[PDB]
Amino acid sequence: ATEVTVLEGKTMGTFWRASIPGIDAKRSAELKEKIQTQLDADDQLLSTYKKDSALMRFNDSQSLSPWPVSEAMADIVTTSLRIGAKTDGAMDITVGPLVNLWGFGPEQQPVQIPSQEQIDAMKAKTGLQHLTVINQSHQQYLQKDLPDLYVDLSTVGEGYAADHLARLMEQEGISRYLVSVGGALNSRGMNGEGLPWRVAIQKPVQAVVDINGHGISTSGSYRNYYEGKRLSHVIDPQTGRPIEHNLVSVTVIAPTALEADAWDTGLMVLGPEKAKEVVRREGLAVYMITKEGDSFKTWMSPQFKSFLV
Ligand SMILES: [Ca+2]
Ligand code: NA
């Protein structure tokens, strides 16, 4: 039994954690500095709450020509656009202005219920089709065909950050770790007890999965979870209205946390029936919780079940 060192801090409006076994204390001290520095840089790349972030500079710009961005920005957006297509638009990184219209952004509250005409007009300003990624040998770009398109990567940033943290671990010669950024995690190697890192999914008891060599993410709709007296604040990108189905939690295991974090949001928006079709077609490892009145129901794909201990 070797000691597991735990490092923790703040990033992206949430928290990160890194567990590492058998690492001495001057190393884990330095590693925290590097982790926080990297996560600060990722936050500065992606945040919609930082006014001079790379993403916000693009958002504020009125240009319809290619806008230079980093490799990570290009790849995050490519992944998001494609999983958006594969979830029939349900995962939409351009939906922000519809969310703001409702006042359902996390740093805002009171606004009138918008009219459908208002919603439909606002939809003209959103859509996965409006965004393009351009890759070349030493450069890459985003390009929007609408000046007032607004890109929000908050639904995939944790997954990216978690994958980027694993890259950092490798860089620093760390072979065994459990790293998390918000709801996204990557697992590799054995813990202090010589066993796979414990990753639990809540089943209303904890069901345990071994996701060694994989990543995981969960997305939910919680305004109903704890009662249904209220609406979801999850907006369907296609209707511009709150989702109406009973799916309250989706957990995805994938080779990368970014993929998991992209899928879980899309599947959540789709609801049980449509999500299951996507999960079947794409061969995804997914765990779903639905709330019927007062009762909770769960569903796991076969691919998810492979991860159960
Ligand atoms: Ca997500
Ligand atoms: Na549109």
Residue numbers in the entry: 12 to 215, 222 to 244, 247 to 328
Question: Can you list sentences taken from the study reporting this PDB entry?
Answer:
We recently reported a flavin‐trafficking protein (Ftp) in the syphilis spirochete Treponema pallidum (Ftp_Tp) as the first bacterial metal‐dependent FAD pyrophosphatase that hydrolyzes FAD into AMP and FMN in the periplasm.
Therefore, we conducted extensive crystallization screening of Ftp_Ec wild‐type protein reconstituted in vitro with Mg2+ and FAD in an attempt to obtain a crystal structure of FAD and metal ions bound to the enzyme. There are four monomers in the asymmetric unit of each crystal structure, and the r.m.s.d. of the monomers within each structure ranges from 0.5 to 1.6 Å and 0.3 to 1.6 Å, respectively, between the two structures for approximately 300 Cα carbons. Aided by the high resolution of our structural data, two water molecules were observed bound to each metal ion and thus the coordination number for the metal is seven, consistent with a Ca2+ rather than a Mg2+ ion as observed in the Ftp_Tp structures. Thus, in agreement with the original structure determination, we have assigned these as Ca2+ ions. Superposition of three representative Ftp_Ec monomers illustrates the inherent flexibility of the loop region near the active site comprising residues 237–253. Recombinant wild‐type Ftp_Ec was able to flavinylate RnfG_Ec in a Mg2+‐dependent manner in the presence of FAD (lane 4), suggesting that this type of posttranslational flavinylation reaction indeed is a protein‐dependent FMN transferase activity, rather than an autocatalytic one.
